Amino acid sequence: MYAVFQSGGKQHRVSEGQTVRLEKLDIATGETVEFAEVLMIANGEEVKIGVPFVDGGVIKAEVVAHGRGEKVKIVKFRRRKHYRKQQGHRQWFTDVKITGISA
Amino acid sequence: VTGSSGSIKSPIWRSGGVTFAARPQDHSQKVNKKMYRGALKSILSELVRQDRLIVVEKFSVEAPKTKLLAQKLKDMALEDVLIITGELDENLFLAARNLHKVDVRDATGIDPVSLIAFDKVVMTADAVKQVEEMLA
Amino acid sequence: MKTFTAKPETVKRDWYVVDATGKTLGRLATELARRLRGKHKAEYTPHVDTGDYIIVLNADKVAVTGNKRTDKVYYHHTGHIGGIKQATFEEMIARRPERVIEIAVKGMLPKGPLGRAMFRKLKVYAGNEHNHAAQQPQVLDI
Amino acid sequence: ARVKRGVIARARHKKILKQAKGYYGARSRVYRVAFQAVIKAGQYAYRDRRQRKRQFRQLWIARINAAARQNGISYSKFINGLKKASVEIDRKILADIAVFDKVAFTALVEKAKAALA
Amino acid sequence: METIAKHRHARSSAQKVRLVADLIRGKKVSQALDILTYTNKKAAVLVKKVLESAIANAEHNDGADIDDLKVTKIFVDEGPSMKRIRILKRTSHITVVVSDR
Amino acid sequence: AVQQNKPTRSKRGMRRSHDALTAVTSLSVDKTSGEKHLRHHITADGYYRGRKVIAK
RNA sequence: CCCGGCGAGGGGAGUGAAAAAGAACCUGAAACCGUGUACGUACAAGCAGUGGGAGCACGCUUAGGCGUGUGACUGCGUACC
RNA sequence: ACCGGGAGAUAGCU
RNA sequence: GUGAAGAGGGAAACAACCCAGACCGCCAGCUAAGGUCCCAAAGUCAUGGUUAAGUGGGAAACGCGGAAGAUGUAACGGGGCUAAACCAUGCACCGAAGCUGCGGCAGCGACGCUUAUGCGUUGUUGGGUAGGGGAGCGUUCUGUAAGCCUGCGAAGGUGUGCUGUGAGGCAUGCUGGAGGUAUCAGAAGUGCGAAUGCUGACAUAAGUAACGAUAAAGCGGGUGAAAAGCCC
RNA sequence: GAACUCGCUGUGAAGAUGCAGUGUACCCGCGGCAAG
């Protein structure tokens, strides 16, 4: 029961009830988003995507929370040129649970 | 440095001198009379506009007793005040030193920092005229 | 999410038999190296063994084209003084048929502990008969 | 007004050393070499944040080629079939699905073969 | 019951006592005493004295059952050193712990 | 005769692996006095093989 | 009081709020030297790290593949001024 | 020959 | 033109050779130079030709010869290749920090709601030595401050968690057992990694030579716990 | 300065333990020959 869908230019293969990680989405925390774009449907008999974004398939993902990702420090230094600068970064992330995939 | 390969008295050396040791100097600044009087007018205007100022016909104590002054302030519902009057009153000055929160000075003794620090200022019938003619 | 990885203790590896006779030395060596590396399997991973054991039969009767019979030479410098021990291809194949295949396969594989682990899976003999009849090694067609 | 720098220097040294844990002895305790080690590690991480994509793409390419060769088609021909079939599925998804499932990959490869011509 | 005995500012090198100490760690007190008595190194006498003091303290403070004492921990630490012309004399701090369990 | 680099503590520790001593583990009990002693040596009390000696 | 040599030193008892204040006596970090615990290493070549990374021990959502501790192997990587 | 002072002497460079 | 002061990919290594100007993050896709026998990601891909010699994988003038090159083949990067060498014609793939897709930050402009003087759009830029300009963080003291916290635990020390693009900030366990100081302005002995910089401490070299004229000690007893070094 | 301090070929501010290729070597001690 795995389906492939893309949200922020990255494809993800997810099943029903499996949380997935995606880039920042402009959706409410307590609301659900319907991705009309699908790349694969898996079942007793699969439904190959003869053309992109098969209409028969759709994904329903409910947002559970938001927040900042793990801290990552990026430092630039140069060979005996006296260049040195470091800065932190925390990419925004969104975790969404998928409940039911249309065939 | 008291003393006498390099030198022992070099600042880098332990127990040596200081590279840029200072000398006794005075930091007093120059303030224009016009600028000072303008600042005094501005502070007085702000003080009156917020209603920090209290004016009475004559504020004095019959006897040089601090308890009497404390009672007079208590019935007036004022604790931290600056009493500014005209001719210095012997009894008030004598019975005002012990109360740190309360300060008394003559008309010519007004200073900006004193006005800022103290919550309220208590003038007199003649002190208002004295300060008005002083500022000009 | 994490990409799938091959656990060394849960890898399904089988055996195979390759006949060296009638096959070009370089091409068969390359194929054997590819199979040892496990690249053919869909679970390839460059930090864990995933290939299948290979048994080579009749290494002495290997087929090589051109004048490689005499032109080819083998050199190893043990050390000390005058370590210039030459080995002509004919002499080596006559005396040590297995060493040519072993060195070729070792060269085709990486250098390091992983490469040694890959090479240790290969067995080579100079005759059809082999003692590894208990593993049921399916013949390899190529 | 004399000011003592002990607190600031100690805090700086503690903070820099806390990031130099496990560097084979001297690098993990001596500030002089710990600073150089941490700077070099930061540069290496900066390069790795971009080399990771290359490494993972190469691994996916290898896995896809391995899966396709079994079905009887080269990787290049498989990609040609996928592209000519108007399929935008990336290599990462195919590599992920080739190990967990085989029927789906078989369908993809046979479709690629059919659409190649 | 755990008993601890220590000796401070020993007239011996810091590391020359660890060699004797290794023969004590993990060994029963009964055999440890004999091993130290029959050891030849100079620090052997100091280690034996420390162990004897430890067992005496254990038996005096503890009720009874001296025979089941095993040396659990023992170590030697750097001590204050004496500086002279250029020469440095080291000192050793011996620590021993004896406990039935 | 001059070291260009300072050997690390690990190398020094490795070089000191052979300096460990050996336990005697050879205590033999006297036949009569019943006190253990080093083999082939008179006891402190002055006994050996059970036979008596000066034992000053 | 006991060990210790009628020593140095130490362990109990007591005073002391505290002896994690003992005359070497407020606070006591690093360099440096140790014991224990967890993991790796005796077929493995190089500025000693960086990503991937199975494995191994503990606590957690009592699994749900989470964190900490080490890092077999692998691509890359020729110190500071 | 050594001690204190001119002297924190003077030029360039490191 | 490049380096100086531009990262990255390729030419095995390499700064001046080819492609290619790094705002930050993502396990997405398409390309430039160069590659698609393995090492190592990609065609043991197709078509028409040359090569029998490993020339390819080093060489002139000159009648295929000319041809002799470096510890070891060592002038293929290793194997190995008779095509896995070269020429020309194609469809594909790999191929960077180049470009595109998603997300985030900042400068520079422009548009308007015009503001309450910001907001919503909008294109562009974001390598950097010397240098210039702008914006901030850390500590001592002064007034704020006879305020506040604090023996129900201050400063300091030592771990953890959460925080911002940064120097840093807050909470808390333990040790500490008496000071610290909100907000806002002022003065600075104001932020350390090197100057064969200086005081103190701690190391390796290391349990390493030496124990110093090559006049020589042996034994019994005594003191002492301990005696080749003391006394008889 | 830090070290988990091998040989050969090649390049390199020009004889490379550290750069490209390849080969050898179980971990750790003790005594000398001095090519470095």
Residue numbers in the entry:
A (entry chain R): 1 to 103
B (entry chain E): 52 to 55, 70 to 201
C (entry chain J): 1 to 142
D (entry chain Q): 1 to 117
E (entry chain S): 1 to 85, 95 to 110
F (entry chain 0): 1 to 56
Sentences from the paper on this structure:
The 23S rRNA consists of six architectural domains that, stabilized by the L-proteins, define the shape of the 50S subunit with its three protuberances. Here, we present a biochemical and cryo-EM based analysis of the earliest period of 50S assembly, utilizing an in vitro reconstitution system with purified rRNA and L-protein components. Taken together, early 50S assembly occurs in a domain-wise fashion, while late 50S assembly proceeds incrementally.
Once densities for domains I, II, III, VI, and their interacting proteins are present, the large subunit´s core has completely formed (state C). While state d1 can mature to d12 and d126, an alternative route involves state d136. Both states d126 and d136 can convert into state C (d1236), a process we refer to as core formation, that enhances base pairing between the 5‘ and 3‘ ends of 23S rRNA. Subsequently, state C transitions via intermediate steps into state C-CP-H68 (48S).
